[PDB]
Amino acid sequence: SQQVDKIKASYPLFLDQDYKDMLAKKRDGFEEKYPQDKIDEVFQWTTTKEYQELNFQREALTVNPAKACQPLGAVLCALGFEKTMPYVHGSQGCVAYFRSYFNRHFREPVSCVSDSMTEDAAVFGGQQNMKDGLQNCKATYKPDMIAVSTTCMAEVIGDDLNAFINNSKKEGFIPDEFPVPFAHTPSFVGSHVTGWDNMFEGIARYFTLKSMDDKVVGSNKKINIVPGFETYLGNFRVIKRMLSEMGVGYSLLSDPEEVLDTPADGQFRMYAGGTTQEEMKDAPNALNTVLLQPWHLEKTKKFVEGTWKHEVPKLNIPMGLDWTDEFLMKVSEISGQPIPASLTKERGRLVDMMTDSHTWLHGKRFALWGDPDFVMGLVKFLLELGCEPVHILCHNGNKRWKKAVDAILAASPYGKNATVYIGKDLWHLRSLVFTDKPDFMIGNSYGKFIQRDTLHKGKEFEVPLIRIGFPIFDRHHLHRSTTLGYEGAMQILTTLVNSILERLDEETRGMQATDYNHDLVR
Amino acid sequence: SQQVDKIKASYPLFLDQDYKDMLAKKRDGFEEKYPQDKIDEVFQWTTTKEYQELNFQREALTVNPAKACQPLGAVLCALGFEKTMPYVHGSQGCVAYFRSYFNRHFREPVSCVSDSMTEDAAVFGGQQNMKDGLQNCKATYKPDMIAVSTTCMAEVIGDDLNAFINNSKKEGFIPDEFPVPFAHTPSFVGSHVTGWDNMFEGIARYFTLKSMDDKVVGSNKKINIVPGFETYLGNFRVIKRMLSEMGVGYSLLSDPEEVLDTPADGQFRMYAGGTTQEEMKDAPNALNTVLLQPWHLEKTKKFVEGTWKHEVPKLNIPMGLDWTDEFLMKVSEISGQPIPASLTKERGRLVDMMTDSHTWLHGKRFALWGDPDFVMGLVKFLLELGCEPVHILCHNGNKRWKKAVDAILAASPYGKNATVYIGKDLWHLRSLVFTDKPDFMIGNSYGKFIQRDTLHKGKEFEVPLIRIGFPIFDRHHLHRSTTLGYEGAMQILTTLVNSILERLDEETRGMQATDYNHDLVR
Amino acid sequence: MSREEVESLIQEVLEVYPEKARKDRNKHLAVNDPAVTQSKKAIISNKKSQPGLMTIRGCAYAGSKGVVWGPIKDMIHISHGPVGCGQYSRAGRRNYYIGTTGVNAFVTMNFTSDFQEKDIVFGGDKKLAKLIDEVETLFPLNKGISVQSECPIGCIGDDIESVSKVKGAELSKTIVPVRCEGFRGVSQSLGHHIANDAVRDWVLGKRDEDTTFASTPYDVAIIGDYNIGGDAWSSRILLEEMGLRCVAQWSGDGSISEIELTPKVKLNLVHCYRSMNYISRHMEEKYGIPWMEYNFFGPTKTIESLRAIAAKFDESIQKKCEEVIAKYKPEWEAVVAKYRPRLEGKRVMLYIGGLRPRHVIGAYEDLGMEVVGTGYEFAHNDDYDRTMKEMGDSTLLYDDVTGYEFEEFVKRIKPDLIGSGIKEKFIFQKMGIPFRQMHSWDYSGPYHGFDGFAIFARDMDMTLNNPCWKKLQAPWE
Amino acid sequence: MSREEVESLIQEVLEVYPEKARKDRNKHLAVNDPAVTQSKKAIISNKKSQPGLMTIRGCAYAGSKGVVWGPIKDMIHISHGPVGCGQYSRAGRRNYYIGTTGVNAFVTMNFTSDFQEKDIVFGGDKKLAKLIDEVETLFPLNKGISVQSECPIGCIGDDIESVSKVKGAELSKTIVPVRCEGFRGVSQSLGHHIANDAVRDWVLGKRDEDTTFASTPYDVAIIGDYNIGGDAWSSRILLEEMGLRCVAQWSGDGSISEIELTPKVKLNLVHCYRSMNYISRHMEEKYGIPWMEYNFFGPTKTIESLRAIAAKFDESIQKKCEEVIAKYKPEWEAVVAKYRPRLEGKRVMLYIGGLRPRHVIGAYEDLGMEVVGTGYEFAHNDDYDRTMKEMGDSTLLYDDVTGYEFEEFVKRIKPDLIGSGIKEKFIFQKMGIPFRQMHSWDYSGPYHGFDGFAIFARDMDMTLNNPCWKKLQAPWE
Ligand code: ICS
Ligand code: ICS
Ligand SMILES: [Fe+3]
Ligand SMILES: [Fe+3]
């Protein structure tokens, strides 16, 4: 039943007695459910060290991964270019997922097409799907560029993208001058961040490989910036802001922040802003190119160093105090522009906040996951705050990366309890936070089911989730935040210390039991 | 007892069994405590409508006020001027409290002096304290200006500030040309926002009253901006940001954002930035003067309109969408500058955020308190989101202000359940949130004890606190945030909607009980 | 708009297409005529999508894993292939359930074989056999496994049926191979059929020669209710207040045991015809169990369905039915009295999957709103057979609409509210058009039944009449 | 630093002052000589503050309401006057207690008469009587009321003593008028004395003719421990493990009944001599109860204090004393072993109120640290008598230090760590000098007792050795 003036949605509607009674009869009558004693016994077992050893012995089963497949990153890369339509050669289901995945994180429209290869294309290949697809895409949505990626189906059958695209132009489906860069993005290699790298290299190749005769390094007095797979709008904005602060000429290659934050003013803008074709074609003339996330831009690095002949600097992701310092100093050296007083002040204010909140952060133990560059940067900043990263998981990380993070941990007393895991998933981490419990997790929305599991053992075992990463589906507008630079470090710090103080306030909220420590001032 | 590798602080140390047993013996032996049944019976009584009726009949007792005294605002006002030392003529205990109060909110040094009047001044007056204090303060801390306010001690005994300062200059304790503006700030009149007004009008008079002859309205092509009592650094910065964006020449009168955010770079800066004396002297030459918080700048308005002959526009505090729109349109009208494209886009991104989160915000019920201009602006924005402000409390509000807020509520369907309270305290509001329970409170740190009380009645009765206002003592670095303009509107909206979702996630975290509604995507 | 004007809008929109696509899309756009009974001569459906036009359709894996199999709570479903499918489909669909997640229920978890290149080159059958063992060790309370094939499994040619047979026999466990690769079919709809056949071939018949269940004349099954926001629960309670015994729910909050029991019921109550008519026809053909279509959207349809269902039994069920109707009559009348005045005359366009585009119409008319345009992503012609009689004359129908068509239709028709999916929602909010998610219910619901109508009405009012929609134009613009 | 260099430092700092202030402040600065017993010849204290030099002192209202009376939990304390004092002092001091706040305990609440201009002109005595009735109505479980006078009460000529007598007789309730107006005295110190006389005159003697309390030979009272972060609890547990019965705590977590029961104890254990020695002497003179000063900061002082207290009783108490020391010996030795190597040789400068500037030196010394400077806001010369034997030779002493002085001393002395109050903390963190709040314990603690030493060491290590302090200089500077 419903009270018209106090309507109940699913929660707490199904807690009404008649619904409880109905659901009990459904279970007892027809579900043949395991006894609650057995369920309780098995759950307790899944929290044990005995279970953890069996868990980490997995060789074939994956449970709750922390990564996505290549074309997702290729799509995000393509979105950063002016009037460009992402186009995934293969089966249409993939695009339906890519768009929905990004729709729910950014709460914005995400445009992307498929050429809808079906079982017919499985036998004869998808050349006809590409011909008609490019013509239909260009006529209907009128992009200035189509950037092509692939689904696994097209990769398995081995479609020749270069041949298909050439034939579309030779047979008149799309003008020969119309730009159609492409990249093979097999989902069974790497992860979503590999697709971003592959797509970017494919676009950079398209506009520069056959036009390197007239290029002179340093001739346009700019620095190229490659952001990589980036899902915080603030991270695009803070980089552009700091470079404008120093008066550094720059070119951000792949810039979706305009198209992922269009105003709601009565009209839908399919395209907005983005890196121009002119900026790619001119990019070799820059002083140098900086890769903001080098650990998934290695194929881009090889091309930029091998073809543009840029001396790509050895820089970490600019997260935390030390690595933002090194970023600005390297930029200053390449451009010849000095670090202004306004950034030196912003830096000192971050230090001030670190001194203002160092006692509450000291010694706190964290489990964290995400993409490689994000993760190490987060580990670096946690060490700078005097926190203890304990469980560090990077499902799409490699041995080379692990060694580099282990070295960072070895260089700080606060890393003595850390372990770096690669190729492990969020069911592995769940066991870790039961057997070697930290104070918090730092991860994406998928971590909420780990917090649910921990609380079910008992309130004292609960590991609260702090939401930093991708995807974040169950909070609104966190994609607007920042994690790079001093500004991002400032926001992370405020999040960590206030998450800690929120949890303390909950634990000391019981009157005459724990509220002796329910201080007004912290 | 303690384990050296897992040292426990007061929580959870005193939950150890030997401490529990000890405190039990302490209670039963010597505290003559009321039986727990009586304590529970009386608490339940304090949650009833019967108790609320007795509660609201109070005529003499105040419990848990939501205001402070005049000189606290006079100090904050003084801090916003270049190399100015706040100086409170009266007793030194007041200054020790003003400094600690601001220290805990800003987590920054706060400088302010007293002349330490003692019991002899009750009979003889405190002229000698002013003489030696002004000389001592100028010589030791070398301010360019000393701004004088008063404690209630000096007000009851009736010290003549003008005579004391004039005699100090006549006899050579300070140079005759050294600027010593002053204002009488009786703590038994108004509240801290009244003291801000009094000090600002006193400073403005000092630099302009006797030099009006050569002044011409509009000759310097600027707009004067008076922020009022303001404790979010972002609010000073957001106003300066939008005005620079439109290329509008301005002068922010009282600007403490530099001194309340100095970098930790090895040196302590007593003074930093601030409004210059030349900006005060030149202020009458502005095109006009805008008051950001007009409901506690009434004395300032009278002087600006009466002496400077500025036609101060009738603007509300620039909070929310409508009132930020009106502010920018009025500045555009006075300055002749168009609203640039960048601010039109920012507005449209705020509108988008409102469309993205409207479903979770609809119908949500709030109790809120704070200062008049902040409270009414928050009420306006909650209406713009489709929220229901239910209990609106302004301890230091007046009849006219109440009439203005009731009209705003009358213009919207979401104000049908609202009640505006003036002169009531947080013990009044505690009864309202028991008898007419809202979903959340929006207030300062003192609201945390209301949430404790409600939870004690039961988890279903708990009203969580959202921390917007002043002071905020139990979280770190929220003073850096913003509430004004579109930027502030986006921050308030993000905080509200995500506070709603955090509570939902807690209410649906119970496995097999309520986690059927523990959705991944919201 | 008049019939001729709607026909002009269709033709004007089709001008932008190349000739090949223009010729096809014209067949998928029509002006409704409620008199027609064979929709095949007005509109074509269930055909391949034209490449590069931004269809809103998914794949067959979505229709099998995401829709049919995933909700089944006490089995573990393996997304077999590379990491993408299982991640993007992890907990996106609000098929609600009661269980201990990770112990005895596994709906919101993502089990996958995470194919790497080595598995593409050498095949995944050895990995799948090992994967099955590992599942059995770490999740001993699972009651069955299904293997949801992703695109490469059929391309690589792996033989998951043999693995399921061998491992199912070895471990005395039900292991269901599903050939729902995304290159099959043209939409989610073939996923339904593949999944229905997998249920038929590997699960449904296990209790054929088991007589253990004591049936009564009032045993039914809810077929094709996936419990979005609890829909199936607010439907089940009404059926059992009426005196019927719901033996099974397919498949929202569904257990494998209650699937195996379904051939024992006396009547199959079909909500989603599109995805579940296949198994219904099979159970009529094999067990002689009749099936009927019903509708629990809005009081008018709910009352019509309750009465139509009760008529299939005896006088006692019919008496209880009128008691159910009498009980809730003040409830939904109060909802209408409150909200219909706030919504009377508002015009809404819908675009959803295969049922709701026609099935929620009566609910909107119960609040005085008019459906001016509707369509499906993947419906067949027997869905359009059932739609045209439900829509007003001269309204607009669109099958597998493209992004460009939908935006342009909306610009012309200027609806007061749009009801569609997540890939559409934020486009139309930017245009200042209230939008309600009619897949996920915008994280609200249930909408089925009497209790759901109250939430549906509240939701449509909150969004359509929200203050935010009056503020999109800046006062200086 | 030699004496000739510290003396030169003092003189160099004083050159900034006008002659009058220079001559006075010189008397309040000294270079320590541990042999001195008559400190009045080396340093002057408990004098008025020089106007306009940014003293760190508070007022007598702080010493009475904030320090002595506020902690009493089952009483309601009225901040009588304008709204300021009661709001800035609301829940700023971490005097911890066990109770149900708003029902039977009231520490963190701010009761005030909120004076307006009408109350200044006509007086507040009528308002006070009405406020008491309203307290009685809305807070029925309060066991007594106190009236903490703010500045205007005395100047306005109000007679709160007559109100308390008349209303206390009418309602049969203990109502204590306290004349702690902030213009009285020169600091918080006179507030202690005024409050102590109020306890004496209105509360302490109420059970003088009541012999129903069952005494034992081991009854003691903890006098002058305000339970900052739980200090008094972690001291109480040791005394009771020693075999003593702690009848009362003044005033941390203290109830009005345990105060009324204190004249029945056998020995008064005084921690804070500054704030509570007045009532101690009065209780010796009137009731014949001896008192002793003790120190529970750090293991060395705690062991010496436990043994000194036990010696005042029989052989059985002394036996439990050595058993207590043996139990906790491995615990504090483990704290020393871990943290002393991280802190050995580090130099500390202190500036606090009236006890801790000398009381915590032994705790620092147990960790191998050296207190190179200390001082008090408001101590008297008998506090400095007890200090100089506890400080190293040629260290720096400062009474009622000014903001300018303190910064200049620190710039020259360059300590590794400073311990002071909230008004000091953020100055020296900008300077890159680790800082610990030694009033609030920086929202940590307890520091008293053996369990407090483990926390004390952890806090000093975490702050002094924190990585943030290595980062203040930009690498390009
Ligand atoms: S009801 Fe079902 S997920 Fe049958 S819950 Fe879902 S509008 Fe899908 S494949 Mo959204 S069983 Fe309908 C469906 Fe199909 S919401 Fe629509 S498209 S034909
Ligand atoms: S003197 Fe001591 S820290 Fe005994 S230095 Fe400190 S005005 Fe505290 S607990 Mo501030 S030993 Fe007094 C004190 Fe207590 S300044 Fe006051 S409140 S009763
Ligand atoms: Fe949006
Ligand atoms: Fe700070």
Numbering used by the authors:
A (entry chain B), B (entry chain D): 2 to 523
C (entry chain A), D (entry chain C): 4 to 480
Task: Please give sentences taken from the publication describing this entry.
The substrate-reducing proteins of all nitrogenases (MoFe, VFe, and FeFe) are organized as α2ß2(γ2) multimers with two functional halves.
X-ray crystallography confirms the solvent accessibility (albeit somewhat geometrically hidden) of this cysteine residue. The α-L158C mutation is positioned at the Fe protein-binding interface on the MoFe protein. Residue α-L158 is located at the Fe:MoFe protein interface, and we therefore hypothesized that the functionalization of a Cys residue in this location with a steric inhibitor could prevent access of the Fe protein (and, therefore, nitrogenase catalysis). The structure was refined to a resolution of 3.03 Å and contained 2 MoFe proteins in the asymmetric unit. The cell dimensions did not fit any of the previously solved structures and might be due to the introduced mutations that impacted the crystal packing. The α-C45A/L158C MoFe protein was found to overlay well with high-resolution structures previously reported for wild-type MoFe protein from A. vinelandii, suggesting a minimal impact of the introduced mutations on the overall conformation of the MoFe protein. Importantly, the P cluster and FeMoco of the α-C45A/L158C MoFe protein were both found to be present and intact. A Strep-inhibition reaction was performed on a larger batch of α-C45A/L158C MoFe protein (∼18 mg of Strep-inhibited protein obtained) to evaluate Michaelis–Menten kinetic parameters and the distribution of electrons toward N2 fixation under a range of N2 partial pressures.
